[PDB]
Structure formats: C-alpha cells, structure tokens
Design a binder for this molecule. Structure first.
Ligand SMILES: Cc1ncc(C[n+]2csc(CCOP(=O)(O)OP(=O)(O)O)c2C)c(N)n1
Ligand SMILES: Cc1ncc(C[n+]2csc(CCOP(=O)(O)OP(=O)(O)O)c2C)c(N)n1
Ligand code: SF4
Ligand code: SF4
Ligand code: SF4
Ligand SMILES: [Ca+2]
Ligand SMILES: [Mg+2]
Ligand SMILES: [Mg+2]
Lengths: 1231, 235, 118, 59, 117, 58
C-alpha cells in the first residue's frame, strides 16, 4: 500500500507516470529531464507497470517529434505520456489540439518553466502551461512534491475514464527539484483504481486494420463547426471524474483535494487565488497571520482546465471583500493574466456582488515568492489596493511593484531547523546534504526538505544548499533566509559573498579554513563578518577540513569532515545517534570501497568531532574596522550591474538596470578574474621553441603570446623575461608567453601539448604564480597585438591576433572553446554568430558574463541565441538582411556615380562596387568611403554615409553542437545548406547532448553509454558529413585540433571563402565523455581520434569540381589500429566494459569494423574520376513565368487550395482522354 | 495618391506588405499562399518597395524555419514580414516570443484559419490568432478587403515606430478570397508616413560586428523577472 | 484469466504493417528531420513517398525535390538548385532499405520493391 | 496496389497534402475494407509529423 | 534496376509544361538549365554505377534483444563527468570528484613528486 | 435600439478605448468569438470584455 520516501517532485511523478503508462515518446529539456531518464533506468532495471510490462521509451529528434509519436501511440491503443517543459511544450502544441480533438487519454507531465523572449530561463513559471491553455487539454496543478505524486495519479486515472487528455504540471525547480519526505502508493494500489471498462473501450476504439476507421479528415464549412462541438459531453463530465479520483485516491492516501480548495479564516475578508508552489508558502503565512487575528484566506486551484466556477465559488467565503488573483506569468498587452481573467469571468457570470478583484504577478523564472512578499500582497488588500502589480522585484520604470518589508518574522512551523551550506563545485556538499536528508528522513519521524542553488559557471562554481527539518510538515517553498545553521565550505567565500545574511541571533556558523590562530582569522575575516559574529552572539566554529582530510589520508577531500560538522552542530539529532547513523552510512556507501577507505572515512569523522569546538572570538570584534580599497579599475557596467549579480545580489537590481530588449554588452568576462585553478602553468623561457601552440590550444584564452620591440618593454617588470624572437620576419622583437593565472582554469592541455621534451610549460600551484604573474599579465596587456606581422591564418600568426572570445564559463579543458576562439582570431571583426541553444550558448552568454569581446577598434562578434531548433535559419535570416541591405547600398553607390560627388568619392565607390563581396577590397574601399564621406548628411551620399557599418563584407556563422545539427535543428540546417547561400556552419561535435546532461544524440557512436543509450548506443553514428556532401554545391569538412592545427586553419580559410554554404564539423572533447587522465589530454585525444581512424579528416571543395579536380580530399591516414585503446581511455566506453563486458567487446568490435569500412569508402571517394560540377551563384534577373502558362490541359484543380486571383479559366481537365485518344475518337465519329 | 482597384483581401494586403518590407521569409499554407506568391511575382517583375528595391523573398522548409529566418533578418536590421495561417502560425510561436521579447518591428500578415483537432479545415476562424495571443505581438484585425489594405498599412508603420511586432489578421477565405472594389494608396504615400528617425534607430540598434552586442542571453532568477518587465514602456 | 485476456487481444495476433505515406514536400522539406530520425531508429516501418516534385495540393510551390530548371512558385524562372538526393542521403545509414520506383517503366520492379521493403 | 498486397494488415500515418485530401476529405472515404471487414486503419495527424505519427503506432 | 540514359531527356522535359514554359519565356536560361539537368543525371547515373560495382559494404545485423541492465556514463570515471550547473543536476548528483582544475593525472603526480617537503 | 463595437486593436486590449465606444445606454451586451477553447470559462474576447467591466468597478 503506502511507502514513505524522500524525493523530489520529478521522481515522485515519474513514479506514477511509469506505473500508469505503456509507451513514452521522449525529449530532454531542463527541468523535466530527470523524469525521462529515470523511466528509462527503471525500464532497464526491469520495473513493470500496472500491466506487468516494462515501459517502451524512445527518444525522438524534438518534442514535436515526441508529441507526434505520443499521438500515434494513443491512436493505436497504448497508454502514453511524455515529460516536458517550456520551449518543448511549445513544439507539442499543434499535436495537443489533435490529441484532445481525437479524445485520447494522453497525459503530459510538465515542469512549468519560462519561455525565451528577452532571454532564456530554465527556471520556474507558468508562461508555458498557459501557452497550451487553448489546446483542449485538461490542466491539473501540483503545489508540492507530495501533491505531484497524487495529482499525477489523478491525471492518469481521469484521462483514461474521460477520454480528455491531461497535462499535470508543477513548478520548474521549485517543486521538481525540491526534495521532500513524502509518501507514495504502490503500483498495485494505482492499478486497482483504473476503470477497466474505460480501458477496454479505449483499446477497442483504437486504430486497427482488423476493425479500421478513418481519423483526421479534412472538413469544409458545412460540418466543421458541428464536429468541433461534438466533444462537449466529455468536457462537461471531466471535472466530476477528476473529483471522483480525488476521492478514490484520498481513501487510499488520506489526502483529500477538491477542484478548488479554501484554507484560512472562514470569515476571511482578504483572499488570494493562486496556483502551484506559491500556495504552500501562502498557507504557511496565513497560519501565522490568522493565528494573530487576521481575517485572511486562500483558494488553491487544482483543476485549472476545465475551469469550473461552481467549484470556485464553493471555495470562496461569503465574507470575502477584496480578492487578488496571482499569476505566475506575463502576457504583454493582455487586459490581464489567465487566472485573473478566469476569476473575473466567474464573478460576472454570477451576476451578484463584485468583491473588488486585484491582479498580481509573481515568480517569473524562479523569482522568490517569500513570506514577506505574501504579507505584502495582503497588506495591499487592506491598504493601497494597487492593481496589476508585481511582487519580488523593484519596478522603477513603470512602478508596478509592491513594497516588501524583509523584517517580517519567520513563519516556518515552530521547531524547524533551517540550514545553509555554501560550497564549491565538485566538493561534495550537495551529495552530502542529499545524504543528510536521506539519513534523517529514514531514521527519524521528522519532515525534511532540501533545495539547492547552483552556479552558471561550469567549473569552480558556487553552490548554496537550503535544508529544513521539523516535526511539522514543511510548506516553505522559498529559500532559507533566517538560518539556525550556516556552513561555508570554501574559505574564499568569506571575502566575496554575504555568507551570514539573516543568520539567527545565536545561530552557529562553521567555517572550513586553515586560519586557526586569532591573528590568522583576524587577518582573513572581513570586519563585516567579525561584527556580525560578535553582535549576533554566534557560536562560531573554525575547522581546517583540508588538514584533517589529508592527515587521515583522504587527501584534502572535505565532504566527510563537513558532513560531520553538520550532524554534530546542526542540532537536528543527538550526537550519539547522529554519528552512529553516520558511520553506518559510510560503511554502506562509498566510491571505490575496500574496508581501508572505509577506515579513512571513519577516521575523518572522529578526527573532525574532536576538532569541532567553538572559535571563541574577542568582544572587540564588535567594533572591528573597515578595509581600504585595493581593487582594479573596471567598467561602469561591471561595477553597476555585473558585479552585483556575481556577488549574488542580482535581485536588488531594479528593472531600470536592464535593457528592454534584453541585450548585454560584449566583454564583461574581462574583469571576472575568478582565479579558481588549483594549478596553473609556469613558462620556462629556456626551453621554449616559440611556437604558440600553447596559446592556440587554451579553452579559456589564458595564455598571451607577447611580441614586442624593446622600446615597448621599457616600463616592464624585472621578471617579465622575454626571449629574442625566432624568425626571419621577427628579428628585432622579443617573445614572451604570458600566463593569465587568474583566468586559467587549471586544465593542463597547454603543458601537455608544449613540444619540447624539456617542457616550456610546467603546472604549479596558483599561489606560487599569482604574485609574480598577475602584474606581468597587467603589463603585457598594454603591449599592442602584432596582428600585421605574420599571416592571420598561419599557426604562429593566428596567435598574434586578438582573440575575441575570452574567459568563458565553459568547463576546464572544454573541447569546444579552443575552436571558437581561433575562428574569432581569423574573422572576429566581420562576424555575425547565430548560436543554437546548448553548451555553446550557455558559456557563450549566460548573464552577467559575456566572453565575446571587441577588438582595439571596437569590432567584434555580433552574437545571438534564438532557439535550439532554428540556429541555421536564424543565421540565414541575418544573411538575407545583409543581402538586401548591402544590395541597397550598391544601388545607391551605382547611382551616386552620377552626382556632383568628387572624383575621389566615385573612384572609391567604383572600388567598393567592384570588390563588394571581397573582404579585403570591400574594406580597402569601404574605409576610403568612410573618410571621403565624413560629415555628409544630405542626398545619395548622406544615405551612403549612414551605411558604413555595411561596407566591409560580413561573415555569417551559425554555431551549434551535435544535438542541434544532427537532431533538432537538422531539417533547417539541411534546407539552409541546400540554399546555396554564403553562410558558414560550425558544429562542435561532443557526440552527445552535453549541456542538458549527456543524452544520446544521433551523432553518438555505436557502443557509447549515455542517457537513452544506457547499455551502449545501438545504432551507428549518423553520417551528417556524407549526407550533405551529396549536394555537390556545399563545402564540407571535418577537423580535429589535436591532430592538426594547420588543417583546421586551412578548413576555416577554405570554408569562409567558399562563395556558398560551408559545414565544418569538429571533434569536441567533453566532460561527459569521461577522459580517464583528464581534460588536460583533450588535445591528445583529438589526435588519437584521427590516428585510430575514428574521426578521419577530409575536405569537399565544390570549386575544384569546377576545374575538373576531385572535390573530395582525404586529410588523415588509415586507421592505425589503436581504436581499442582510444575507446577504453574514455569512460563512456569503459563503463560498459566493466558492467556489460560481453556486450562491450562486441560494440567495440563493431565501432572498429565501422570505421574500417568508412575509411575505405572515403578512400573510394578520393580516388574517383566522377564528380558533381559546381557553378558559383546566379544573378538576380527580371522576369518570371507561372507553371500553368500555355499548358494544353488543366494545370490546377477545383479545390479551394489551388484558387488564386487569376484562376478559373476554361481548360481540358483530362476527363476526355489523351490528345491522341480524342483526335482518334473525333475521326471515328465524323457523322 | 489613391488608386481604385477590384481585388481580394490577400492582394490588397500583399500590396502594402511588399512596399513596407525589405525581406520576407516564406512558407505556403492555405489561405495566405496568394500573398507570398504575389510578392515573389512582383519581385521578378522588379516591383520596388519604398526604398526603391525589389523584396528579398526566400522559401523555407517550414514556418518554424521562416519565423526563425524572420527573427534573424529583423535582428540584423531589415524590415521583414511573412504570410501565414493556422498550423503555420503555430510553428512560429516560439519565435514570436523571441521577436517580441527583442522588440523587433516585424509584421505578420495572417489569414486567420482553423486549427486541426477533430479534423483539419483550411477555412476561416480565429482559433489560430488567439493561439498567438500571449506571444507579445500587437494584433490588428480587419473586417473587409478595404480594411485589410488600411490595417496592413497601420501595422507596418506602427511596428517601426513602436518596436512592438505586429500581427495584422483578416478572416481566411471570408476576407482573403473575397473580391471587392476598393481603393489602395501608392507606394509613395506609404513612404511618406514612415517615421525616419525610428527607422534610423532600428538600423542602429541592429546586429553588426562593427558595433556588437549580445542578444539571447540565458538568465537566472536574480534578473529574469526584471528583464521581462523592462519592455512595459513600449507596450 | 490469462486466456480471457489473450482472447481480448485477437486484433493483435497477426503482424501489422505500419506504413507512413507522404508527398515530396513532406519527406524532403517539412517532415524531413522526423523522417530522418525514424529511419535512423532501425524500427520496422515502411515509408512511401509520392514524388510529384512539387507541393501539389497547395498549388505547385517549389520543393527541395524540385529539379533544376523546373518552373514552380518560388522557382519562377526555373529552380536554380538541383534536386536534393534524399535516397542517397538515407543510404548512408547502412541499415535502411532504400528504393525508387516508377510504375510506367516496370510494374514488376515496383512489386519487387514493395515486397522487399515491407 | 500497395493495399492489394498488404491492405488487411496496414496502419497508415499520412502526411498532409494531396495524399490526405483525396484520401479523406469528408464525407468521401475511398479507403475500404475487404470482404472480411479488414482494411487500412487511416490517419492524418499533421503535415510535419507523419513519420513520427507512424513511429508511434509502431511503438 | 534501370539502364544508362538513352539520350531523350531533352524530349522528356519539353513534353512537360513545367519545363516548356521556360523555353518560351526565357529561352537561353531554359537551354542552360536543361543542359544542366542532363549533365546532372549523367554524373548521377555514373555515381550509381560506381555504387553498384563496389566491393566495400556497410554491414547489417537485423535488430537487438531487449536486455536487462543499464549503466550511467559517469559511473567510475576518474574526473567530474557532470558540471556545476542546474541543467545537469540529477537526484544522485553531488558527490566529490576531480573537476580538472589541478591538471592532468600525470601533471599532478609529477607535481606531487616534485613537492615531497 | 441596437449597436456594435468593432475591435481593431485586439492586443493591447485598451479598456479606456473599449468604453470610449460603449453607449452608456447599453443594457445587455453579447461578445462574439470566432473560436472554441474547450473547457475555458469563456472565449478570449469575452474574457477581455468581462475584465474591463470588473476593472471599471461601476
Ligand atoms: C525545443 C527545445 N527542446 C529542448 C531544449 C533543451 N536543449 C537545448 S540544448 C540541448 C542539447 C544540446 O546539445 P548539443 O547540440 O550537442 O550541444 P552541446 O551542449 O553538446 O554542445 C537540449 C536537449 C530546448 N532548449 N528547446
Ligand atoms: C505546418 C503546416 N504548414 C503548411 C501547411 C500547408 N501544406 C500542406 S500540404 C503542403 C504541400 C503538399 O506537398 P507534398 O508533400 O509534396 O504533397 P503533394 O500534395 O505534392 O502530394 C503544404 C504547403 C500545413 N498543412 N501545415
Ligand atoms: S592549463 Fe588550460 S586553462 Fe590554463 S592556460 Fe593552460 S590550456 Fe589554458
Ligand atoms: S607550446 Fe611550449 S614551446 Fe610552444 S610557444 Fe608555448 S611554451 Fe613555447
Ligand atoms: S561541451 Fe562539455 S566540457 Fe564543454 S562546457 Fe559543455 S559540458 Fe563542459
Ligand atoms: Ca562560405
Ligand atoms: Mg553535443
Ligand atoms: Mg509533391
């Protein structure tokens, strides 16, 4: 029957979904991904649904793909679900009308997430579910982890009985990722509630050639309106059926629900109508206020669609005098948001008293909706009664925001422990917290809640955990803001973040740091922290977690020492019980294992408890005094907007701080200087061969080649050692490789690549390097970049160019960034980038950090992220614009060659005209035109002058990962390349969906382990390259940096210049791949991927085909026979070998067979004499002809689809036979 | 100035669309196909818009493809339209939020058609325009062939000046294929109503590597709500 | 019981033949990403594309299946890009049966393909 | 002729177009059952999704 | 299954109005594009013939049985397999790992060895 | 004694302009929608109009 459980919203609902479904057509999108991956895992574990069968889950190319599959599965008689959210849900909309119009019992489980408008957010709101509002789906909301379980159950059960598809939703992150101690039903209990009649009826009405029917007909005016209205009965009956299952499940669980539920004062005067997790917090504030006399209440909406006013009014206290409807969305221009509009409707429909309805909006993209914000909504009802307000922000442009007083008292149930943990990415804090909740929830009868915040940075990111424990159910769907326990696990946070905000007076603060003596702590603790600690009379504890970790041989891992601090000091459990519980858990779990490591863990625990004593600070900390500034100059914008965001004070920024269209300026990352590397390379001048390979290879632009003549080294620091430049062209210069110790991510690719056996680059601790190199890097930045000295597209030469993409949030050693930094080094000042959503767009522009920057002349990449599915076409659009606009400039130019415009002007104008699509000549003359036309404001010339930003030929790039190119954006990419237009697409191939968590892609190879390919991918890698090479007019190439930096620059140079579409696919190493010796070996793995024949290099240049040459050129050699070693050195292949050895051996043998046949076909291509020719373009000539002009017979039909303004003339419609048949008939009939 | 004319709703609106637009990313779908086909024929005939240039029309692989293209042309500073309806309008929805979120003066001309549910219908109703209700587009309706001409003009001109994308719609078949004796303006009269400073500001804030910016950033809870509310003034 | 349940499944006894029908506009353009993903799946479905080399029903608009020099809407001065090679693109998979037919040339090659594809 | 070889066992996922307009534009339904009442189970979902509509029937 | 081009394309195209209208309207462009289509089908048929006479094939194995068991890609990896972002956060995410900020396995072992103290 | 309010700008819905067109003498007013949103309490234009009247507070 019942089973207690501590899980998040996603798993509570995947639990039920799995049980109730037979099929599942899936697509990954944050934050609903966890539900599909789990179902897939449970299907591999042999979990069975209520019919005794494992679920059939298949990953599609997109959510429009999955929805099309869900519609088919249902039409063919199988219970089906899908897990989705925001951009994903949008693609399901056309099929949702079809699914509901066909009265199918589908159930969609969505984690309501924001829509990408001014910016994308993976966070929680109702913008997406409200967008599917009109599709005919029933909509049933959940406001908690426990409710997600129950509503998921009701949804499935009612959909089967009523035949109206359902969409069960719960807030993205706020509920889906909130962990809570709940109770779930057993699959058998669910199975018992199913209406077998309805189920057999479902099976019998389904598609089957043994009893066929036609569905999806096309209808005219005569019958469409009646057919649309024929489904009314079902919609009339669905609320009663929902209510029915709300009761049936309640007789098994004991948790009752109604379509709409009232909570709070029976004679409430001020009531709020809400939906989602905000209800929990709202009920929690009500409990506090009403106990104090406040006549308030809340109506919780469960069934949003159908909206049943009778059920709404059944929940509305007759005493209600003011009522505010809260919407977790924004519909610009609408007279009011969805729920507000619905409530207004019910009141007028009633025709009686009108209570005064106020509209309010909250929590867009996971914005906090705290007790202070709820109190503010209620105060508004008794005070100002401000309408169409917003809560959670400071609206100072249009004044719609409600004032909020944050000194409002804690409203969490009496006796709730609230804890905050501040960790470093990958230090174990989150896992330890998740394990702390599991231990307490399973060995106590306390309620537990856990919620975590993460960083946009992929390496060295901050984490802040919020946990609550209590004897009373926890309805706190907001962060912890009044802590009983605060833990700072990285001593470096002490000086940058507000670690102690809101900690309760007398609360405990444990800090991990080696600052054990007073002198040390005083020297390292900001005064602000000392005052707080002293005035709030905090029980402060210092513990050098790294020393104990090392002393017990755990080598600096602090997870277990900090976990021990929590059980001993958080006060949730008795010391004895906690440590007993703890040690048993250490025994039971653990990474590698062995009874020895177990012992190191039992050692750390005990070494920690003994060292966990209060740090007894002096009273004088009360009057500790402020520090004098020693910080670098920055941007007004970095100072004003980006920094506040980085220090986690982003919510204090009002609306006026942002651009209305959502734009951000390039280059904000230039001041981040996080300094998160453990080890940074150190240049060793004596061994340097001055090759610039280190700089070329850096995933973060952390190495700076310096080439200065001696007069430029005048104010240079003593240790700014610079060698004499090696080179015919570089005689008088001095050369120095300058490390940017603060921007370096500690990967190791450079040192690993450095050619001399006696390395010119050696990894060293950051402390040994920063004092010397921070000032040196500052000086080196003043040195002009010698871009003119050597060719821009030569190895060494390219690194003497300004990189226009620097210091991104990509992971240390990322396989994608090195490629994009050098592309910018070749074309940056002329480029437009149409980036597909993915890793590329996350490190490329997740606010407030902007890696892309401008050069010394303010030129840089115009960057944009449209959607995941459209990158190719987003870029084709930019290109259509330059075509149209530059074509307009050309017509103007060709016209001004007739004015009293100077001869200088006309000669430069003819120049521009002559080399307009030539980047050199368009610029050589475009700059002359900039000078000769300066100040001209009137006439053909004044217009021409305002078009200078169009003079030089632009370079349109479309960037995207493999999932974009091979799956979701594939149809669009294919169409854009097929267009013949001059665009360049750069696909970073990680062979997996990287950013969303390692989900299988069609680019994923045979045998690779990933989500949805968990026993090894069983279909080979799609050959995108060869597929597009069938065009003949598209330049296609594959590159791999670690194998050849010069082939990569040749490809870039040949692709950009090709007067047509280019497709360049590059092997990108990724953390999801599991490189066993580190990402510092990426360059080496890229090398081996080519040498083993896994990733052969080649180029298909159509212009050679036009000279009678073979367009296909193979750039790499035959498989060397090291694939086995190449595969086994990556965990994505090596895990299968450990788990499923028999299968691994086969799949690895298959991958080898595959690349063997493939290289052979490639060789066959390179040796051919037969090739598709190519002609550059085609001029825009005037004239056009309709296909039906002058035809002998009818060229169009009698249908409304073919009707055009000039249709309708008499013609032979082929009902009298062939021309010859008629002529013969005629001659046989004379009469 | 004025010119009397007997045409249907589609051509009365294609008349204006052509003159006011520079680029057009297209996909055919009944009953708005006539508009795109006419714009293409007029471009071959070398008809000129208000800037004295023929329109740049390219057919895409779908209306999602076309909307993806329309957002791109606008981001890069070119006036752009598209002609669509029902199932096609649905595929443009993700881009419509982006096009309006980024305050772009696009203009969609839609022959409001029914949505396929129990059955498909190429016929007229407002199920589709109501589906794009929440996208942040301004919606300007027409009730006749002659108003299709006029609202098509107001939509373009106001989108340029206001920066809010517009969606001019009229009933599928009932207005789009109804022929009437109307009166249309000349391209020059239309050109004279254009707010040139708004149009110069559109060009200047557009994507160009000679004065770059980053658009389409990923945003956290700390700032998304504020960023979403920053466009209020325009609306 | 088990047998009564099995008896209710008789409409499932004989192996079904899932067919996907579509014209060129569908296969070469709009439904192409999905078609490509379904054939990539390796599952047993049969897709029959009727290639009119144009979007027929909506009034002769150009398709990627439209050959070079053909007059159609949006290719009104003759389509200036060749016909996309869908057949050869999908043959790259190795695990997908691909064929072309033309009734007027060979009725038996058409029956052979159908029998071999199904 | 396809229905003459497999008609009684077939499911048809048809993409929008002429195929779906002569195939089932109401009230005319050319697809028929055999003497045994077996015949093609026909359905039109959308224009863009036929392959996946059919993939689902198969799922 | 079919034989090499019989040289009648020109006639086959001119018998259809989709091709014949261009010849009437835009004569030189028509002759050009008709010569292009003939060239294309020639190169294509030859490419098809090349395929037919090949000795190099992509193998095929029918299907694959629904086997029990699955493993996560990050299982037993030496370094962090997942990042610090909300996108990658899963129920069992959160354990300590080497996030590549100290350099390669070798670099660290070397550094450690060069630092004994 | 009958009339009609024709909506030109549907979005943004400006209540002030809607009431600017409403005869003070209007006593019953029906809102016509050319759509069907199954299960919604009412169609789009209807919902918007009801909104303007409650917002009015008259
Ligand atoms: C329509 C839609 N569905 C899904 C998503 C979520 N999503 C976006 S990026 C991505 C995968 C990225 O993969 P890839 O293209 O390989 O890029 P990488 O991160 O690997 O470089 C997914 C599933 C989305 N943003 N929109
Ligand atoms: C998403 C969407 N946009 C466009 C249409 C309109 N449309 C339907 S079928 C079709 C063309 C038909 O082409 P093809 O697939 O070649 O089929 P045929 O008529 O040639 O046999 C178009 C443009 C639609 N129904 N839905
Ligand atoms: S260790 Fe990595 S991040 Fe640091 S400079 Fe070298 S390549 Fe760049
Ligand atoms: S890779 Fe090594 S040898 Fe080459 S320039 Fe850099 S430090 Fe010098
Ligand atoms: S591609 Fe992989 S290594 Fe690079 S940022 Fe993405 S997850 Fe990290
Ligand atoms: Ca190019
Ligand atoms: Mg990828
Ligand atoms: Mg066709």
């Amino acid at each position: 029957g019942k089973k207690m459980m501590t899980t998040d919203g996603n798993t509570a609902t995947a639990h039920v979904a799995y049980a109730m479904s037979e099929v599942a057509a899936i697509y990954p999108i944050t934050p609903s991904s966890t539900m599909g991956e789990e179902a897939d895992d449970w299907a591999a574990q042999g979990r069975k649904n209520i019919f005794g069968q494992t679920l059939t889950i298949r990953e599609m190319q997109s959510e429009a793909g999955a929805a099309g599959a869900v519609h088919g599965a249902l039409a063919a008689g199988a219970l089906t679900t899908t897990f989705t959210a925001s951009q994903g849900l949008l693609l399901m909309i056309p099929n949702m009308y079809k699914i509901s119009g066909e009265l199918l019992p589908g159930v969609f489980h969505v984690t309501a997430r924001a829509i990408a408008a001014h910016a994308l957010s993976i966070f929680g709101d109702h913008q997406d579910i409200y967008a599917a509002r009109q599709t005919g789906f029933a909509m049933l909301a959940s406001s908690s982890v426990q409710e997600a379980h129950d509503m998921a159950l009701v949804a499935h059960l009612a959909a089967i009985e009523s035949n109206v598809p359902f969409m069960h939703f719960f807030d993205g992150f706020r509920t889906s990722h909130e962990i809570q101690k709940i109770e779930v039903l057993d699959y058998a209990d669910m199975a018992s509630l199913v209406n077998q009649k309805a189920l057999a009826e479902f099976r019998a009405k389904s598609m089957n050639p043994e009893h066929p029917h036609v569905r999806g007909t096309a209808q005219n005016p005569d019958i469409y309106f009646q057919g649309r209205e024929a489904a009314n009965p079902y919609y009339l009956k669905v609320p009663g059926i929902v209510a029915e299952y709300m009761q049936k499940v309640a007789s098994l669980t004991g948790r009752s629900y109604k379509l709409f539920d009232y909570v709070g004062a029976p004679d409430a005067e001020r009531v709020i109508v809400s939906m989602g997790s905000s209800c929990e917090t709202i009920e929690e504030v009500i409990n506090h206020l009403a106990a104090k006399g406040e006549k308030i209440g809340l109506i919780k909406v469960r069934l949003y669609r159908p909206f049943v006013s009778e059920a709404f009014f059944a929940a509305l206290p007759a005493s209600a005098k003011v009522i505010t409807v809260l919407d977790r969305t924004k519909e610009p221009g609408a007279p009011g948001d969805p729920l507000y509009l619905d409530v207004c409707s019910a009141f007028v429909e009633r025709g009686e008293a009108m209570p005064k309805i106020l509209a309010g909006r909250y929590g867009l993209g996971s914005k906090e909706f705290s007790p202070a914000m709820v109190k503010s909504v209620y105060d508004n009802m008794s005070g100002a009664k401000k309408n169409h307000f917003t809560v959670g922000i400071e609206d100072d442009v249009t004044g719609t925001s409600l004032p909020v007083d944050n000194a409002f008292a804690d409203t969490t149930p009496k006796g709730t422990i609230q804890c905050q943990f501040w960790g470093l990415g990958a230090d174990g804090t989150v896992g330890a917290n998740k394990q702390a909740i599991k231990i307490i929830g399973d060995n106590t009868d306390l309620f537990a809640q856990g919620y975590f915040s993460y960083d946009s940075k992929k390496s060295g990111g901050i984490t802040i955990s919020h946990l609550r424990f209590g004897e009373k159910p926890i309805q706190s769907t907001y962060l912890v803001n009044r802590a009983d326990y605060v833990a700072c696990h990285n001593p470096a946070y002490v000086g940058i973040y507000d670690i102690l905000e809101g900690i309760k007076d007398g609360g405990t603060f444990v800090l991990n740091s080696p600052w054990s003596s007073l002198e040390d702590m005083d020297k390292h603790l900001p005064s602000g922290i000392k005052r707080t600690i002293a005035n709030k009379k905090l029980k402060f504890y210092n513990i050098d977690a790294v020393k104990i970790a090392t002393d017990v041989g755990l080598g600096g891992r602090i997870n277990m020492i900090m976990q021990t601090a929590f059980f001993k000091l958080a006060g949730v459990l008795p010391f004895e019980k906690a440590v007993d519980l703890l040690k048993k858990s250490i025994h039971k779990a653990y990474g590698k294992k062995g009874e020895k490591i177990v012992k190191m863990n039992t050692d750390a625990v005990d070494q920690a408890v003994t060292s966990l004593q209060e740090f007894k600070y002096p009273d004088s900390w009360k009057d500790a005094p402020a520090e004098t500034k020693a910080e670098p100059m920055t941007n007004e914008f970095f100072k004003n907007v980006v920094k506040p965001i980085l220090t986690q004070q982003g919510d204090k920024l009002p609306v006026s701080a942002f651009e209305a269209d959502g734009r951000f300026p390039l280059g904000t990352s230039q001041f981040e200087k996080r300094g998160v590397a453990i080890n940074v390379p150190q240049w060793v001048p004596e061994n340097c061969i001055q090759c610039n390979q280190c700089a070329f290879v850096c995933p973060h632009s952390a190495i700076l080649p310096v080439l200065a003549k001696e007069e430029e080294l005048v104010g240079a620091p003593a240790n700014f050692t610079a060698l004499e430049a090696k080179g015919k062209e570089l005689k008088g210069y001095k050369f120095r490789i300058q490390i940017n110790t603060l921007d370096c991510m500690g990967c190791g690719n450079c040192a690993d690549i450095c050619p001399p056996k006696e390395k010119a680059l050696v990894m060293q601790p950051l402390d040994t390097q920063r004092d010397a190199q921070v000032p040196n890097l500052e000086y080196a930045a003043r040195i002009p970049v010698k871009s003119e000295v050597l060719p821009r597209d030569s190895l060494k030469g390219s690194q003497f160019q300004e990189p226009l993409m620097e210091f991104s949030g990509a992971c240390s050693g990322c396989g994608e960034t090195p490629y994009v930094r050098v592309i910018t080094q070749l074309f940056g000042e002329r480029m437009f980038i149409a980036n597909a959503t993915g890793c590329s767009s996350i490190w490329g522009a997740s606010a407030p950090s902007m890696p892309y920057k401008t050069n010394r002349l303010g030129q840089g990449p115009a960057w944009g992220n449209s959607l995941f599915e459209d990158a190719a076409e987003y870029g084709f659009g930019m290109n259509m614009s330059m075509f149209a606009r530059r074509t307009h400039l050309a017509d103007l130019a060709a016209k001004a060659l007739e004015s009293d415009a100077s001869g200088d002007v006309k000669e430069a104008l003819q120049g521009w005209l002559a080399g307009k699509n030539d980047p050199i000549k368009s610029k050589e003359y475009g700059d002359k035109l900039k000078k000769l036309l300066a100040g001209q404001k009137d006439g053909l010339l004044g217009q021409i002058a305002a078009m200078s930003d169009l003079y030089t030929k632009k370079s349109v790039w479309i960037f995207g990962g493999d999932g974009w190119a091979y799956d979701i954006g594939y149809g669009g990419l294919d169409h854009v390349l097929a267009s013949g237009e001059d665009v360049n697409v750069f696909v970073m191939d990680t062979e997996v969906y990287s950013n969303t968590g390692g989900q299988s892609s069609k680019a994923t190879p045979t045998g690779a382990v990933a989500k949805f390919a968990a026993a090894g991918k069983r279909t080979g890698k799609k050959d995108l390259a060869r597929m597009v090479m069938t065009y003949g007019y598209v330049y296609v190439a594959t590159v791999s940096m670690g194998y050849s930096k010069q082939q990569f620059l040749k490809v870039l140079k040949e692709a950009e210049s090709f007067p047509g579409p280019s497709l360049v696919i590059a092997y990108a190493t990724c953390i999801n791949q599991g490189l066993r010796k580190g990402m510092g070996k990426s360059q080496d793995v890229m090398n081996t991927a080519v040498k083993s024949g896994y990733w052969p290099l080649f180029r298909y240049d159509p212009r050679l085909a036009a000279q009678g040459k073979n367009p296909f050129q193979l750039d790499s050699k035959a498989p060397d026979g090291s694939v086995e070693e190449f595969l086994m050195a990556q965990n994505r292949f090596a895990v299968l070998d450990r788990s499923f050895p028999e299968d691994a051996k086969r799949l690895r043998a298959q991958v080898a067979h595959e690349l063997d046949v493939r290289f052979k076909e490639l060789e066959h291509m390179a040796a051919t004499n037969i090739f598709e020719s190519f002609a550059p373009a085609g001029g825009k000539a005037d004239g056009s002809v309709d296909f039906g002009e002058g035809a002998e017979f009818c060229t169009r039909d009698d249908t409304p689809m073919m009707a055009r303004p000039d249709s309708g003339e008499a013609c032979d419609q082929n009902r009298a036979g062939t021309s010859e048949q008629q002529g013969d008939l005629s001659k046989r009939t004379k009469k």
